[PDB]
């Protein structure tokens, strides 16, 4: 019956019936996340357990048409998404074993305490107990106690549980046609569509390693200035001048973001940053003028207005009833034309540069709403947060803030306070690029069998001195599981979608600040009142997953691959300032000195 | 000649915006100051005609549409605001002299009864395997999903599929007094002008 036509019939019936079931299963979650109770907790589960049965029936139906006969494009791009079964390919008892392991690891990570040697009755949880010791303190031994305690308490319990999860998820991803569980995660970046826009799974491994060698003459200048500023605080006997940084002195439990080192490594500590929170609270900005002035931005660059029910259905402030909401900003797309934002807004310049983020999410969600059901997302996993973060880059410049009278009109842009801003940006952006590359490389190598079971703790600290440039303060052996002390490793989350979206939101901004006729440095660009840079952003937002990400990137930028040259064009004055400041210092490190010896 | 009485505008329940009722009058003596004295007029935005010289001209046809419409969403009926109103419910004709009134119906008007909710439509499309095919409105015409939406909406975003087409409603309750909307449009005659005012 001309198998493409049977696939067209099946996809038409699925698109008809899959809209009333996916709206109930999202309204039952909106009615829980803003009104946390027990009856809502029951309704959310009993309405989200019909959608999973319907979707699994759809997947078992769709695993009947062989995709080497369907000669269309959007009727072959949907059968291949519906044939991606997932964990439900296992035997009916190994699935319960996998659920047991994957829930036990999450509970072990969640209920994690460290009890001190002075008073053993006094114990501290991670949030909010240990992430004030490991974010405020400048004491060596206290930070070493917290770091070694968290590692020795949540690594020895998660080492024998991370060795069954590897064996089961190398079977889940082996009964689906992939080679290991690294390929099952890397196959979000695949494309075998029309011509010249083909991307293999195994090109991502070399594209990431090709982009990192461009961001590593700048990280070696950052990790020769941060090291000097730490030497000026802790002392020359604890921190060397040609070795790596010890791991616990990074302003974080895992050393992911270096943002808490800004109190120590600030270039000019007499010139303060711009803060309009006093000017917002002394001009009577409520929690609704923020969202109505973050909409005159999108209507000025050329995008859409919000809907009519968005203003009466959303939760734009924390309620004063007996509702106990969870205060964490999310932007919902519930289904049949309603878009809602949940956020507990207060008057600061941190809920002002989050209204633009959460509105850039639903301005993406409002644009691909003609695409069927499965083709409604970003082109890969890093596209949906790269367009939410090119709005916060232009909603914070000292010209967009000066056009709203949140700044004094006789401003002077204060030459030192652009290096004081670029360093605060760099400690967050370039500080995490070796970490999200090294952790994902270690995971891809232990999933495919390139790192055997007897050398996980050895190869982790062998790679953390060659990539990140961070040494360990305590000798570790093969009973620890130091990677599993992170949230995204214990809760089974992919982690390259934070590396391949710090690269996309400078390829986006270098194109949108070329279309808006901007002559100057890139870190003070402004897509405001510019419809030419909103008519080519709308060519990207319109697609969904109907086009592969290479073509959707060529339509905006002009080059269908990743590139780190716009990141180095953003951090261009900081690099020239750092090369003057690091005059006569050893750029780089030698991986042989250790603080324990 | 005779009276074009506005009795169907002043009785029953005014319908929602998609199912708007039309009251084209001809060959009578009219008095719009009789009509607009009964309401609390909140807007008189006109196009290619003036509100002072509308009430006494001689024309050939006189078209009045009316529906129940809250006056807080008065920025969605304006031209050049491509929302969910002018795309699916009602798109005003502009190639003719027209006006637009938004009233605030008083409680001393006892003959007009009150509905339970305001309502409009958020989408009206035609499903397939390649996605949604939207059916936008034509200027001055009803929506193509009219026979589908005439079953009643009970909750927000309740849809109604029938074969090809698929419409979707949205309701919200009425607070205070009732508010309507009158889209009055005329046409200048060429041979006989029978729509001349009451003097
Ligand atoms: C939060 O959820 C609770 C569920 O326990 C809601 O309580 C019920 O709400 C429905 C909604 O119409 C009422 O019909 C029931 O009579 C309520 N039952 C009880 C025991 O309260 C509660 O209303 C919700 N809160 C909000 C603000 O929506
Ligand atoms: C999966 O395919 C089966 C057919 O093998 C579908 O089952 C039919 O569903 C229709 C619904 O209108 C019934 O009228 C038929 O009697 C069913 N036939 C059988 C043999 O069960 C099923 O609906 C499909 N499911 C999805 C999600 O597409
Ligand atoms: C975007 O455009 C608007 C309108 O052209 C600018 O707002 C005007 O700015 C001038 C500056 O001299 C004021 O005199 C006007 O009163 C403003 N009008 C309004 C309606 O606000 C706005 O400054 C532009 N934004 C940027 C960043 O250039
Ligand atoms: C048209 O309807 C009005 C409704 O009030 C009639 O009443 C006159 O309205 C004007 C409005 O400014 C007043 O100045 C007059 O005092 C009103 N007159 C009376 C007797 O109430 C008006 O008479 C009607 N027009 C005709 C020609 O009958
Ligand atoms: C988005 O909403 C704004 C509401 O402020 C719309 O702006 C109005 O546009 C009309 C068009 O002629 C003007 O007559 C109004 O004066 C504008 N309002 C204000 C307060 O100035 C805007 O048109 C809407 N945009 C879209 C695409 O719907
Ligand atoms: C209706 O009119 C009478 C007399 O003019 C007045 O007393 C009464 O208050 C009016 N009703 C309302 C609701 O204002």
């Amino acid at each position: 019956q001309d198998i493409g036509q049977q696939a067209q019939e099946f996809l038409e019936e699925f698109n008809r019936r899959a809209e009333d079931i996916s709206y109930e299963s999202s309204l039952a979650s909106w009615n829980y996340n803003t009104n946390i109770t027990e009856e809502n907790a029951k309704k959310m589960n009993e309405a989200g357990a019909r959608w999973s049965a319907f979707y699994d029936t759809a997947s078992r139906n769709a695993s009947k048409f062989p995709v080497d006969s369907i000669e269309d494009d959007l009727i072959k791009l949907q059968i291949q998404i519906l044939q991606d079964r997932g964990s439900s390919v296992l035997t009916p008892e190994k699935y319960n074993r996998l659920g047991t392991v994957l829930s036990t690891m999450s509970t072990i990570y969640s209920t994690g305490t460290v009890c001190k040697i002075n008073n053993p009755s006094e114990c501290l949880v991670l949030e909010p107990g240990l992430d004030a010791i490991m974010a405020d303190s400048t004491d060596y031994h206290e930070r070493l106690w917290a770091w070694e305690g968290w590692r020795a308490d949540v690594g020895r319990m998660m080492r024998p549980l991370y060795e069954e999860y590897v064996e089961l998820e190398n079977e889940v991803a082996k009964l689906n046609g992939y080679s290991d569980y690294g390929d099952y995660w890397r196959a979000n970046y695949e494309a075998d569509f029309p011509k010249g826009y083909e991307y293999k799974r195994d090109q991502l491994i070399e594209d990431v390693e090709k982009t990192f060698k461009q961001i590593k003459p700048l990280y070696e200048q950052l990790h020769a200035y941060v090291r000097h500023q730490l030497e000026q605080v802790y002392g020359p006997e604890l921190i060397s001048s040609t070795g790596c940084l010890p791991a616990h002195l990074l302003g974080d439990m895992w050393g992911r973001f270096w943002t808490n080192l800004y109190a120590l490594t600030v270039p000019y500590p007499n010139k303060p940053n711009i803060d309009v929170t006093s000017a917002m609270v002394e001009k009577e900005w409520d929690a609704n003028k923020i969202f109505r002035s973050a909409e005159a931005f999108f209507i000025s660059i050329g995008l859409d207005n919000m809907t009519e029910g968005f203003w009466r259905d959303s939760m734009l402030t924390e309620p004063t009833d007996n509702r106990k909401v969870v205060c964490h900003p999310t932007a919902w797309d519930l289904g049949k034309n309603d878009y809602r934002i949940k956020m507990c807004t207060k008057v600061t310049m941190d809920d002002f540069l989050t209204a633009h983020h959460e509105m850039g999410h639903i301005e993406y969600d409002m644009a691909y709403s003609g695409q069927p059901y499965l083709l409604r997302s970003g082109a890969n996993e890093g596209f949906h947060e790269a367009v939410g973060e090119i709005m916060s880059l232009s909603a914070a410049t000292p010209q967009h803030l000066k056009s709203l009278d949140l700044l004094e009109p006789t401003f002077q842009e204060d030459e030192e306070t652009e290096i004081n801003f670029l360093l605060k940006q760099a400690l967050t952006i370039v500080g995490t690029m070796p970490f999200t590359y090294m952790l994902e490389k270690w995971r891809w190598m232990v999933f495919s069998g390139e790192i055997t079971k007897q050398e996980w703790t050895k190869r982790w600290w062998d790679m953390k001195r060659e990539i990140v440039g961070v040494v360990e303060p305590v000798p570790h052996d093969e009973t620890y599981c130091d990677p599993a002390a992170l949230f995204h490793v214990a809760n089974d989350y992919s982690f390259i979608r934070y590396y391949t979206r710090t690269i996309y939101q400078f390829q986006f901004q270098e194109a949108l600040c070329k279309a808006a006729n901007h002559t100057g440095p890139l870190h003070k660009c402004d897509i405001t009142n510019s419809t030419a840079a909103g008519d080519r952003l709308r060519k990207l937002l319109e697609l969904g997953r109907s086009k592969p990400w290479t073509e959707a990137l060529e339509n905006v930028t002009g080059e269908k691959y990743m590139n780190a040259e716009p990141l180095l064009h953003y951090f261009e004055p900081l690099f020239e300032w750092l090369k003057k400041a690091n005059s006569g210092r050893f750029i780089g490190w030698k991986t042989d000195w250790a603080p324990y010896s | 000649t005779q009276e074009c009485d506005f009795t169907p505008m002043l009785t029953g329940t005014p319908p929602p915006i998609y199912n708007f009722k039309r009251l084209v009058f001809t060959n009578c003596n009219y008095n719009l100051t009789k009509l607009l004295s009964l309401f609390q007029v909140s807007e008189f935005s006109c196009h290619q005609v003036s509100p002072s010289s509308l009430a006494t001209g001689c024309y050939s046809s006189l078209t009045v549409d009316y529906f129940a419409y809250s006056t807080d969403m008065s920025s969605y009926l304006q031209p050049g605001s491509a929302g969910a109103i002018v795309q699916f419910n009602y798109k005003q004709d502009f190639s003719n002299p027209t006006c637009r009134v938004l009233a605030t119906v008083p409680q001393n008007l006892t003959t007009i009864t009150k509905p339970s909710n305001y309502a409009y439509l958020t989408e009206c499309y035609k499903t397939s395997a390649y996605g949604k095919n939207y059916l936008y409105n034509a200027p001055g015409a009803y929506t193509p999903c009219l026979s589908l939406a005439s079953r009643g909406f009970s909750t927000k975003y309740q849809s109604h599929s029938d074969g090809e087409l698929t419409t979707t409603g949205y309701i919200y309750p009425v607070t205070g007094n009732l508010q309507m909307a009158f889209i009055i449009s005329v046409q200048y005659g060429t041979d006989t002008n029978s729509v001349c005012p009451m003097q």
Side-chain angles (χ1 to χ4, degrees):
Chain A
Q1 214 257 252
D2 311 327
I3 321 175
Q5 193 173 158
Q6 279 187 163
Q8 186 154 13
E9 255 90 300
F10 163 69
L11 276 179
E12 176 164 346
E13 202 62 80
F14 177 82
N15 284 284
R16 285 203 145 87
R17 281 166 73 253
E19 196 62 88
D20 304 295
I21 316 185
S22 162
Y23 176 73
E24 175 189 6
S25 146
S26 286
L27 191 59
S29 298
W30 178 266
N31 286 348
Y32 175 75
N33 282 175
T34 71
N35 188 34
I36 297 179
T37 29
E38 193 48 73
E39 323 297 320
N40 299 332
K42 237 298 130 292
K43 253 97 76 62
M44 176 183 186
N45 298 332
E46 77 117 329
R50 286 193 296 266
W51 163 247
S52 289
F54 165 78
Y55 195 89
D56 187 47
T57 319
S59 264
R60 295 185 294 103
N61 274 9
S63 291
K64 293 169 184 174
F65 323 110
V67 299
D68 58 83
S69 299
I70 308 178
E71 57 270 80
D72 205 295
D73 305 63
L74 295 195
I75 331 177
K76 204 183 61 187
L77 197 38
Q78 299 174 74
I79 304 296
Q80 285 181 357
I81 296 178
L82 286 182
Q83 277 182 16
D84 178 53
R85 296 217 62 190
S87 171
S88 304
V89 82
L90 281 183
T91 77
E93 63 101 357
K94 273 180 182 171
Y95 188 41
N96 302 280
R97 181 57 198 170
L98 183 60
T100 300
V101 168
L102 253 178
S103 65
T104 315
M105 282 166 44
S106 177
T107 312
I108 283 180
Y109 176 72
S110 179
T111 75
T113 55
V114 177
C115 308
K116 46 188 61 181
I117 325 171
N118 307 345
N119 188 25
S121 182
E122 174 184 5
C123 305
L124 277 169
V125 288
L126 175 59
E127 282 124 15
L130 292 172
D131 281 19
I133 302 179
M134 300 233 59
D136 292 353
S137 176
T138 60
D139 204 5
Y140 190 92
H141 290 265
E142 190 191 20
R143 285 178 151 268
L144 184 49
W145 164 81
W147 191 86
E148 182 60 35
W150 178 261
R151 253 66 171 189
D153 286 43
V154 216
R156 295 174 184 165
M157 292 190 62
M158 223 180 293
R159 174 92 182 205
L161 286 184
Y162 206 75
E163 288 183 48
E164 309 193 44
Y165 159 82
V166 165
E167 292 205 49
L168 287 183
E169 299 281 82
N170 271 25
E171 189 185 335
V172 161
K174 242 173 193 57
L175 281 172
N176 280 346
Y178 306 98
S179 185
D180 49 303
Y181 204 56
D183 286 12
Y184 190 87
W185 274 349
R186 251 150 39 204
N188 193 271
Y189 290 78
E190 210 196 6
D192 37 357
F193 274 81
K195 251 308 184 59
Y197 305 101
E198 321 165 57
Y199 211 76
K200 304 185 175 183
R201 275 136 48 184
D202 314 79
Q203 270 189 224
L204 182 54
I205 315 175
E206 76 186 29
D207 251 65
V208 167
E209 293 175 1
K210 191 169 60 178
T211 55
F212 183 66
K213 301 175 185 168
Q214 314 185 44
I215 328 178
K216 210 220 170 187
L218 166 67
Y219 182 73
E220 296 187 323
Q221 299 280 344
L222 203 78
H223 185 285
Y225 170 72
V226 162
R227 183 175 59 200
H228 177 74
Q229 295 285 337
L230 293 193
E231 184 187 1
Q232 292 299 307
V233 168
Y234 292 105
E237 297 306 280
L238 299 176
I239 309 171
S240 74
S241 177
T242 40
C244 331
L245 301 171
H248 54 279
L249 307 178
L250 293 181
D252 223 280
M253 177 65 76
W254 316 276
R256 177 131 99 99
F257 299 109
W258 293 6
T259 334
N260 303 282
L261 290 179
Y262 186 68
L264 297 186
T265 77
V266 41
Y268 303 95
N270 293 315
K271 302 305 183 179
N273 274 340
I274 43 170
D275 227 6
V276 307
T277 302
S278 174
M280 281 168 70
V281 88
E282 291 186 43
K283 218 175 290 298
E284 301 298 277
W285 280 56
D286 47 352
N288 189 268
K289 205 192 308 301
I290 294 176
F291 282 96
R292 277 225 166 87
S293 96
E295 182 194 72
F297 178 75
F298 287 91
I299 210 57
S300 88
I301 77 178
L303 294 178
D304 295 326
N305 273 335
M306 292 306 164
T307 56
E308 141 76 14
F310 168 82
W311 296 107
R312 90 162 55 89
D313 291 322
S314 321
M315 198 186 77
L316 304 179
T317 175
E318 174 172 67
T320 46
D321 323 335
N322 277 17
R323 310 142 113 273
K324 189 204 300 104
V325 321
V326 35
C327 277
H328 182 73
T330 40
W332 292 69
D333 170 29
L334 271 85
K336 300 131 107 173
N337 222 275
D338 61 0
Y339 315 100
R340 303 182 193 193
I341 285 181
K342 173 183 81 71
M343 185 175 173
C344 307
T345 310
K346 23 196 61 64
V347 196
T348 42
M349 204 190 50
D350 287 311
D351 300 306
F352 180 72
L353 321 166
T354 324
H356 295 88
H357 189 113
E358 297 312 298
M359 270 201 167
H361 282 340
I362 63 179
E363 288 288 339
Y364 204 171
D365 280 318
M366 210 181 304
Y368 54 73
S369 66
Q371 309 293 330
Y373 174 66
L374 303 162
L375 319 178
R376 272 188 218 163
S377 187
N380 58 68
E381 29 187 42
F383 265 73
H384 220 292
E385 282 265 310
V387 313
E389 286 190 331
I390 55 177
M391 310 308 183
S392 304
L393 277 184
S394 48
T397 60
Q399 47 214 89
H400 174 81
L401 287 184
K402 211 213 310 301
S403 79
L404 309 184
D405 296 333
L406 294 177
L407 233 45
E408 176 74 21
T410 56
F411 210 66
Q412 220 54 233
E413 201 95 18
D414 195 18
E415 158 81 288
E416 287 103 44
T417 333
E418 70 178 27
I419 306 183
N420 273 14
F421 172 65
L422 280 180
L423 190 123
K424 230 283 182 61
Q425 282 286 291
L427 289 175
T428 312
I429 291 176
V430 215
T432 184
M433 293 296 258
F435 186 76
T436 71
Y437 161 59
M438 191 266 315
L439 183 124
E440 194 58 44
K441 186 176 184 179
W442 180 86
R443 221 136 56 116
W444 288 345
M445 288 210 296
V446 302
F447 268 140
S448 71
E450 301 180 29
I451 293 178
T452 69
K453 205 96 66 62
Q454 277 70 50
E455 53 185 314
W456 290 0
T457 326
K458 186 176 65 65
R459 295 287 255 113
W460 175 255
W461 295 105
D462 284 14
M463 289 161 51
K464 213 162 173 58
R465 309 184 193 190
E466 300 184 344
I467 301 181
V468 194
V470 163
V471 77
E472 37 174 339
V474 163
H476 278 261
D477 55 82
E478 222 65 32
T479 58
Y480 296 88
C481 199
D482 292 60
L486 189 44
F487 169 69
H488 291 75
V489 186
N491 287 262
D492 192 26
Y493 283 142
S494 177
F495 212 68
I496 209 62
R497 64 157 155 261
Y498 301 99
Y499 183 84
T500 69
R501 76 116 244 266
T502 336
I503 263 170
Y504 287 163
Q505 53 111 161
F506 295 107
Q507 277 194 295
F508 289 169
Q509 185 84 327
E510 240 273 71
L512 303 192
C513 296
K514 193 195 304 164
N517 249 20
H518 183 72
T519 67
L522 204 76
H523 74 278
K524 49 176 61 172
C525 166
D526 239 21
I527 37 144
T528 319
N529 290 328
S530 158
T531 60
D535 287 4
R536 89 185 317 178
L537 184 60
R538 211 211 317 270
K539 278 165 52 60
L540 169 72
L541 304 188
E542 199 205 355
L543 299 185
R545 298 180 61 179
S546 52
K547 255 62 172 62
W549 66 273
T550 40
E551 188 169 8
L553 196 65
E554 194 192 48
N555 282 7
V556 177
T557 57
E559 34 160 5
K560 42 173 144 49
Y561 285 122
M562 306 177 193
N563 233 32
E565 286 294 286
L567 205 150
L568 311 179
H569 190 214
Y570 192 96
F571 298 103
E572 205 82 285
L574 180 78
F575 191 61
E576 297 300 289
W577 182 82
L578 283 178
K579 281 191 302 183
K580 302 167 206 166
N582 297 336
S583 187
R585 305 180 189 172
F586 180 78
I587 306 302
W589 53 90
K590 303 181 180 179
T591 87
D592 50 77
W593 172 84
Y596 46 88
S597 74
Chain B
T1 299
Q2 291 187 33
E3 185 96 346
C4 23
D5 203 7
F6 301 143
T7 312
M9 302 167 49
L10 306 180
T11 194
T13 299
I17 182 178
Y18 52 89
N19 201 342
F20 57 93
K21 264 179 285 174
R22 188 162 264 177
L23 245 304
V24 178
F25 275 142
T26 17
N27 310 20
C28 63
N29 256 20
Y30 62 94
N31 185 16
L32 261 74
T33 59
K34 173 67 173 302
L35 160 69
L36 293 189
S37 50
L38 302 167
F39 300 108
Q40 316 176 195
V41 165
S42 171
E43 190 172 313
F44 214 169
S45 174
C46 291
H47 181 89
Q48 288 189 12
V49 86
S50 58
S52 57
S53 186
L54 177 62
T56 45
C58 275
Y59 321 105
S60 58
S61 70
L62 177 76
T63 296
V64 173
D65 311 339
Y66 61 98
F67 43 89
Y69 189 78
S70 67
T71 56
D72 282 322
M73 328 157 50
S74 174
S75 58
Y76 292 82
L77 274 176
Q78 290 181 2
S81 179
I85 296 293
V86 298
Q87 285 179 346
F88 303 107
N89 301 270
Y90 182 65
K91 186 179 182 184
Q92 188 190 345
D93 180 29
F94 273 94
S95 59
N96 255 325
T98 163
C99 290
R100 174 164 67 256
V101 194
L102 272 79
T104 328
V105 179
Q107 208 171 176
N108 263 337
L109 192 63
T110 65
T111 32
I112 282 291
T113 44
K114 183 173 301 178
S116 50
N117 305 288
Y118 299 120
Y120 61 88
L121 299 170
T122 45
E123 38 178 42
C124 159
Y125 65 98
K126 179 189 294 283
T127 342
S128 290
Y130 300 93
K132 298 180 174 179
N133 188 42
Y134 280 137
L135 305 180
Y136 297 142
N137 229 79
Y142 282 78
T143 173
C145 288
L146 186 70
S147 68
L148 247 180
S150 299
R151 308 173 178 179
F153 296 117
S154 91
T155 28
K156 297 184 178 176
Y157 303 104
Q158 175 190 19
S159 64
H160 279 343
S161 316
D162 206 325
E164 305 290 330
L165 263 36
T166 298
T167 177
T168 295
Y170 173 82
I171 66 177
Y172 64 103
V174 182
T175 46
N177 282 327
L178 200 55
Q179 281 142 345
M180 299 179 61
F182 306 98
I183 317 290
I184 304 178
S185 300
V186 307
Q187 273 192 10
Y188 288 109
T190 49
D191 310 327
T192 54
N193 294 34
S194 63
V195 185
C196 289
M198 184 160 62
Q199 305 168 2

